[PDB]
Amino acid sequence: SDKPVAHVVANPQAEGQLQWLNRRANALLANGVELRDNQLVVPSEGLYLIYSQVLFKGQGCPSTHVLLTHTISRIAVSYQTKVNLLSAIKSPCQRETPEGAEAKPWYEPIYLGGVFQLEKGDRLSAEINRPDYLDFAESGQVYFGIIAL
Amino acid sequence: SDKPVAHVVANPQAEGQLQWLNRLLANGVELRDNQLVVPSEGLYLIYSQVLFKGQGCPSTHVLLTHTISRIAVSYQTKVNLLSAIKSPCQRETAKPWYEPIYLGGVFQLEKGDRLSAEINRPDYLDFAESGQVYFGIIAL
Amino acid sequence: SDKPVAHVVANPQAEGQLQWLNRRANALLANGVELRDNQLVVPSEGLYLIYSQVLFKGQGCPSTHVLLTHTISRIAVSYQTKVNLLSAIKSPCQRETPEEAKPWYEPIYLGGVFQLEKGDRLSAEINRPDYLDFAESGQVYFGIIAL
């Protein structure tokens, strides 16, 4: 109660895309924070803890080299441009699975978190490059949240 | 002080289980049945880290899971709040492998809610780096 | 805005070392927190959220086994002793790539709440600075905030 806060989760029913839902159990979106165009809107200036987690899953390793990225960006009203705040890269595959050997699943989580000075009207986005590898099987694996401290 | 807070660490002497010791734990938060009990409603930052370690890669595929669950007073049943999966071995071999998992998020908790932080492979836990397998909350 | 806070990022121009800068772009260091000797100084006692991230990168796997560590330590004023707060280990390479080397990425994120004293100094260190990746700001960071 009181402080601006949000904790949104990926829509498990949206295949191959990262769509944040707020209307779920153990999810938050109150005290001015809005979810518009898949982005969190800051209702007032202050110091905010921003964090997100994504979980990637793939069946075996393909011929091409896979890079998984997760990025939290800020779109300021003053600029109206996307600026990266937190990002990370992961590479699940060192070799393509030998032809004839069984394809084994791989899992790669990425967590991002930090405190930033935000202005009223700033929009925050948490995006990945490979939504086709996203894993929604279990609740609590893909989430995105902020809170004014 | 003031607000409920807890920071418990894994018992390195507990074989085949993830057992939290009763050493931060103040301002109403209790540790009973290996679970943190919420003393009052409010917004809580929940976080946990586990460290997995193995001396090699087996023929079969190993899945490491870490999960923070909630047992709400209103909805009394185990519900996932934060969870993650890792696969340490892509190919069969002996060289050691290391896998950390960190979880963190803000949630609205009610008085009497019980929080658990659990793993599936306690035999792969790493206690070399004492104090690195932990589970904590703090009301914001 | 009231609370002691810091969010510093790695210097991209410092080769082979982890040097924290207090920048003009989304980096914080206000309300008493100081950056001295590449170390964050706590201005007042309380519970602090501490977190850091590093990103390691290598252009293949070497003959020896690589262990990547990231560690947040505390240096108390009264003791001046080093206490480990947060650490993690990762192993990017299972076998040395036999002679087409492909790049690998391994990030390490740390986070926890700790009771800190006025004047305590916090350090965020790695063991393999030669594998550090600075291309994109916001991939190597270190921050605290009193809760």
Residue numbers in the entry:
A (entry chain A): 9 to 157
B (entry chain C): 9 to 31, 36 to 105, 111 to 157
C (entry chain B): 9 to 107, 110 to 157
Article sentences:
The recombinant cytokine NGR-TNF, carrying the CNGRC tumor homing peptide, has shown a higher anti-tumor activity than the corresponding wild type cytokine in animal models, thus allowing its use at low, not toxic concentrations. This enhanced efficacy is due to the CNGRC motif that, through the binding to an isoform of the aminopeptidase N (also called CD13), selectively expressed by angiogenic vessels, increases the delivery of the tagged cytokine at the tumor site. Despite the large body of evidence supporting the vascular targeting properties of the NGR-hTNF and its vascular and antitumor effects, a structural and biochemical characterization of the interaction between the recombinant cytokine and its receptors, TNFR and CD13, is still lacking.
Single crystal X-ray diffraction was used to assess whether the CNGRC peptide induces a preferred conformation of the N-terminus of hTNF in the NGR-hTNF molecule. The 2.65 Å crystal structure of NGR-hTNF is substantially identical to that observed in the absence of the N-terminal extension, with a rmsd of 0.81 Å for 373 Cα and 0.95 Å for 2701 total atoms in the trimeric arrangement. The N-terminal region of the mature hTNFα (amino acids 1–8) and the CNGRCG hexapeptide could not be traced due to the lack of a significant continuous electron density in the difference maps. These findings indicate that the N-terminus of the NGR-hTNF molecule does not interact stably with the cytokine, is endowed with very high flexibility and can thus attain many possible orientations. Hence, the crystal structure of NGR-hTNF demonstrates that the targeting peptide in NGR-hTNF does not stabilize a different, specific conformation of the cytokine, and remains available for the interaction with accessory receptors such as CD13. This study superimposed the newly determined structure of NGR-hTNF onto the crystal structure of the lymphotoxin α-TNFR1 complex to model a possible geometry of interaction. In this model, the N-terminal region of NGR-hTNF is positioned between the three TNFR1 molecules, allowing the preceding peptide to extend in the solvent and thus interact with other receptors. These findings suggest that the N-terminal fusion peptide does not hinder the interactions with the TNFR1, and could be available for binding to specific molecular determinants on the cell surface, thus modulating the TNF activity. Taken together, these results demonstrate that the addition of the CNGRC peptide at the N-terminal does not modify the interaction of hTNF with immobilized TNFR1 and TNFR2. These results are consistent with the determined NGR-hTNF structure showing that the N-terminal region is flexible and does not modify the hTNF structure.
